[PDB]
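Notes, p. 3: input format for complexes.
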Amino acid sequence: ALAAPPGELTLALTPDDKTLDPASLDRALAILAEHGILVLTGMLRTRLTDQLRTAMLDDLPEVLRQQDVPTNFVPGHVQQDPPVRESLLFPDVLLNPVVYQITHAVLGADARNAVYSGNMNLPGSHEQPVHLDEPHLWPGISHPPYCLCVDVPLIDFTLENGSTEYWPGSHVLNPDECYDERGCVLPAELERRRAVAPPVRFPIPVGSVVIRDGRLWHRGVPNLSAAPRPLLAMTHYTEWFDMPPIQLPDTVKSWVDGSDRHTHAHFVAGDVDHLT
Ligand SMILES: O=C(O)CCC(=O)C(=O)O
Ligand code: NI
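Output follows (276 residues plus 2-oxoglutaric acid):
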C-alpha cells in the first residue's frame, strides 16, 4: 500500500504558483506522455475546497431522492454536478492557470473545458469495472491525446474512502476488441497489462489536482469510510472534439468568456438547475 502520491507522478506546488518554470512544465508533460496521470499537490486553497465540499454534501440528498439516481456502472458511484451558482464558480477551479498551462501545451491553445461535473462515492459502494472515460478515436490506431480529465478531490482521498485506481501508461494502449460500448476494458487485457505495469492507488490530499489522459484506464473502488467522498470533475478537449456546452449563469460571462483559458459554455439569463 502507498502512503502518498508516487514521486514519479507528482509535482509539488503552492496555491500562489501561477505558472510552472520551463523545467517543471517539461517534467509535467513527460509524466503525462509516459504515465498518462499527473498529481499536482498544493494547488487549491482550503476556503475553495471547503465551500465546494459543503455544497456537494448539502446537494447529495436531492440527488438520492431522484426517480433514477444516475450511477456509474455499479451501486454507490453517483454522478453529481456541483452547483453553477455564481458564489460557487471560482476562477482558480474553472480557469486554473497551471492546469491550462499544461492542457495548452498538450492539446494546443484552443483546448477548452467542456465538463463541470462530479462523482459522489457513497459508503459501501461496489468496485467499478476498469474503463476509460473517453475512447480512442479509431480502433487499432496509436494517436496523441485529445482530452485531459481534471480531477479535484473535495476531501482527503484515502485507500479507505475510495481514492481512484489508476493504470499508469494505459492511455496509449488501443488493441483490437479490448473496449466495449461502455468504455470498459476486457478482463483478459487487464490481466495481460497488470503483469507489465500494475495499477496504483494512493492517498490524495484535498487541495491537489489530478490531470490524466481521458483514455487512461481507471476504476472507482469501494468507499469503506462512514462518509460520502466527493470528487469535482472537468475535462479539457481539443477544439475539434464535439461536446455539448456547460450551462453557466450569464453573471459569470464577464470572466469566463474572453479568457485565453477557453470554456465551451452556454450563458443562461436565469438560474441554472444543475441536479435536474
Ligand atoms: O469517482 C471515482 O473515483 C471514479 C468514478 C469513475 O471513474 C467514473 O464514474 O467514470
Ligand atoms: Ni471513470
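The radius of gyration is 18 Å.
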